Each structure stands twice: as C-alpha cells, then as structure tokens.
C-alpha cells in the first residue's frame, strides 16, 4: 500500500472526502448552474450520440477538473514515485467503470422503442418496413461499438496498472531482501503473493464500484418505469410496487444464498487443511519406511474423505437453494408484470426494459457478494504479507 499509493489511510480518506464534496456540489447545486451556463438541454439521445452530448461533455470536464485538482494537491503535499499510476490511474479506472454502466443504461433505454416497433410489426403483416429495423440495429451497433472499444482499452489499462502495482511492491521487497531472506517462504511471498494481492484488490475494488454505480444508475430507471405498473399480483396495489418487489427479490435471494454459503468457506478451509496434512505426511517420503506408514496415510485419507463428504452434503444444500432461485427468476421477471400485461398498461418494449432492469440489479447484487468473496481471500493474502513484512520489523 505504502509502496504504490501515498500515505494509504490519509490518501483514501481524502479521496472519499473529495468525492463526496464533488458529488454534493454537482448532483445538488452547481451541476444545473454549469448546465445553464453552457446552455445544455436535458434531452439525452437514445443513440450513441449521447456520449458526446453537451451534458456528458460538461460532466467529463467537471470530472477532469476535480481529479486534476485532487492530483495536483497530492503531487505537492506528498510527492511519490508511482503517483501517476496510483492517483491518475485509479481515477481512470473509476471513470471507465462509470462509462460502461452508462453504456448499459443506454442499451436498456434503446430496448424499449425496438421491442415496441417489434410489437407494432407483429400486430399486422407488412405494417412496418424492414428499414426501420435496420435503423434500430444500426443505433444499437453504434452503442455496442463504443462499448467494445471502451471495454478493450479498460482491460488493457487495468492489467498494466495491476502490473505496475506488482512492480512497486517487488521493488520495495528487493530493496530489503537482504533482511527478509531469513523468513520462511519469502520467495513465495515476493513472487506469488504480490501478484495475487494486487489482482484481487483490483478486482474487488472494481466489482464493488461497479455494483454501486449499477444500483445508482438503475434504481431511478426502475422508479420511472414503475409508473406503468399500477398493481402487483396477489397483493394488489403497493405504492412503489415494482421497485420494492425487485429490491426485495434481489435482497432475499442474496440473503438466502449467503445464509447457506457462509458455512461453505469453513468446510473448504477444513478440506484444504486435511489435504495439506496428507501432503505433509506424504512428504518425509525420504525418511524410509519409518514415515508415511500404511496406518498413517490410511488415517489421513480417511480424514480427508470425511471432510470432502461433508463439503459435498453442504454444497448439495447450497445447490438446491441456488438452482431453485435461478430457475424461478426467469419467470419471476414477468410474474410481477402479469397484471399489467393483462390490463394493457405496459407494452412489449416497457416489459422488456423492466426485465432488463431486474437482471442488471440482480447482477449488481451478485457483484456485491462476489466483492465480499474476493475480500475474504484478500484478507488472507494481506495477513500473509503483513506477517512477512512485520517479521523484518
């Protein structure tokens, strides 16, 4: 942390404080003032031309100015070596994640007119010409090309940034290898642990950030779409029925999966422990017939067999829960819209858009739980590296 970034606690606290200050000044206050100064209308096109629209360009300029001011403060208060990769490299990753979320939102918005046109064409034969379908596909292809280019460049930069982090940590460790030599398994730390800790932290940060922005982007969309869904099945009219139902479904799914998926890491750790013990007893195979005797290997294999069987049973329970949820979700997407389909309050496009929003929200919750899962191994590797570094001190 101290090798790549500046002072870690202070750096992260200042980053969060400045992000909150900028969000407060923009989303409530000066954002509309700057839009009025620039004369940018609120009309956001559904095509790929929204990403160079005046609102988007104004936000890009504001983000660039804020990040530049933060970087200029941190480049003079505490100069660093990897400041250009840690301060201006994390901001780029965050911005590209937000841009990809916005691209997904644009695709979601495009999903409504396309399926509305599909329904209109299916209403009567040869009512809608094929050139309209070609134009809609062209719009989607423009958006998708933007997404492809941005995603490819994002992956390139993410990989290079991770390797720069590994390079910084490796440089620090080689600077003190003369003192860190007399530590058990130091070569494994400097080679494997550095790369795995950098990659896992990168992945966890990106997953958490992407889940947060996915929720922030797709909750207002669902709130807007809920105006065409007067009532839910069975229960009837719930004021914000669609938003409440989607949030409750995703939350209960993730809670049900996590309640039975918290016992699984303990059993996995137990299986790893007994496998390591079996390998250790198989090691000492240079000690003739004295070690690795038939009774000892028999006992250790019996232990690993029992632990594996326990893991199999518990994963049977988890599999029942997860597969049932996954099978139900496909038609639970449309179950909440059945009364609106019957009553004719929504069209094909709105129904497809609502199902897409449900899927994206569920994916955001899955990214949150997977971020926690990555944080588990991250804590493991951080404990290893912290012990390795503290043994020097």
């Amino acid at each position, epitope marked *: 942390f101290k090798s790549f970034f500046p002072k870690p606690g202070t750096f992260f606290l200042s980053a969060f404080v400045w992000a909150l200050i900028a969000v407060i000044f923009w989303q409530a206050g000066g954002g509309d003032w700057v839009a009025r100064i620039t004369g940018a209308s609120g009309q956001i096109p559904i095509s790929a031309a929204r990403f160079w629209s005046l609102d988007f360009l104004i936000f890009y300029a504001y983000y660039i100015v804020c990040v530049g001011l933060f970087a200029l403060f941190w480049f003079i208060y505490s100069p660093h070596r990897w400041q250009y990769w840690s301060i201006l490299g994390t901001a780029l990753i965050i911005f590209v994640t937000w841009f990809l979320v916005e691209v997904g939102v644009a695709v979601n918005a495009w999903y409504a007119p396309f399926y509305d046109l599909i329904q209109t064409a299916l209403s009567s034969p040869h009512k809608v010409t094929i050139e309209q379908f070609y134009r809609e596909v062209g719009v989607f292809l423009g958006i998708a090309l933007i997404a492809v280019v941005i995603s490819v460049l994002n992956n390139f930069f993410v990989s290079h940034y991770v390797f720069r982090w590994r390079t910084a940590m490796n440089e620090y460790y080689m600077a003190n290898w003369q003192q860190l030599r007399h530590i058990e398994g130091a070569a494994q730390r400097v080679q494997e642990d550095t790369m795995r800790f950098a990659s896992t932290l990168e992945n966890m940060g990106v997953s958490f950030i992407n889940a947060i922005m996915t929720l922030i982007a797709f909750l207002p969309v669902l709130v807007t779409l809920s*105006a*065409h869904v*007067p009532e839910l099945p069975i229960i009837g*009219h719930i004021p914000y029925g669609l938003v409440i139902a989607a949030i409750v479904w995703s939350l209960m799914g993730t809670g049900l999966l996590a309640v039975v998926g918290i016992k699984l890491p303990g059993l996995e750790f137990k299986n790893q422990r007994v496998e390591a013990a079996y390998r250790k007893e198989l090691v000492y195979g240079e000690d003739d017939a004295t070690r690795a005797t038939p009774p000892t290997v028999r006992e250790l294999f019996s232990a690993v067999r029992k632990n594996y069987f326990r893991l199999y049973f518990h994963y049977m329970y988890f599999n029942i829960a997860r597969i049932l949820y996954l099978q139900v979700d496909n038609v639970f997407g449309l179950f909440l819209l059945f009364p609106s389909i019957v009553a*004719g309050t929504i069209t094909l496009g709105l129904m497809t858009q609502i199902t897409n929003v449900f899927g994206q929200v569920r994916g955001a919750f899955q990214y949150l739980i997977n971020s926690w899962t990555t944080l588990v191994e991250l804590m493991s590797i951080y404990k290893r590296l912290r012990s390795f570094e503290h043994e020097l001190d």
Partner: nanobody
Amino acid sequence: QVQLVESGGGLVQAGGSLRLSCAASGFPVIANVMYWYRQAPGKEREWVAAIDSSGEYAYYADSVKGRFTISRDNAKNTVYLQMNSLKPEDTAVYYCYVKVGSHYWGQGTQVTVSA
C-alpha cells in the same frame, strides 16, 4: 353488483378541458384500483389512467401524461378524469373499469375534440 355509469364528456374545439365522472353503484369500490380506458375509432382500447384505492397514487399513460388528471372521491364512489389541453386525437369513447370479483366496464362516453 357494481354498475359503472359514465357521465360528462362531449364536443370541444381543442385546448379545452372536459371532466368525466364514473359513478359506481353497488358493492363498495373503495378498495380497488380503478381504471380509465380509451377506444379511438379504428383502433382497440388503450389504457389512459389508473387510480389507487385512496386516490393518493395516480398512474398515467405516456400519451396522456400531464395533460390528464385522475382523482378519487371515495364515500361517493366516483372517479374523475380531467382532460386538459385536448389534442384532436384525444377523440374517442372513454370507458371506466373496475374489477370486484369480476370485471366491470361502464357504458363509455363519446368525446369529440374538433380542431
């Protein structure tokens, strides 16, 4: 049970406003979402508005959002649709719908919006 009756609505010269009252008479409809539908000559019925059991929450179609207002007046069983800024394609037969065990459509009123 419930016998919906539509009253109001007639000939307007665009821009004007029209108030339609859907008076119910039978089993209480103070606990059901009550709908206003529209059928233009040459097309099928279209959803216009929906109102909660309390009148607090109102839902509108995109074509009639803002220009139309749906209100409830429970304890007299009468929903009210106010048509403001009547464009010429807002000419149609307007129906009132409520589901209480079974479906109940009203004898919709014809509204003409001349240009």
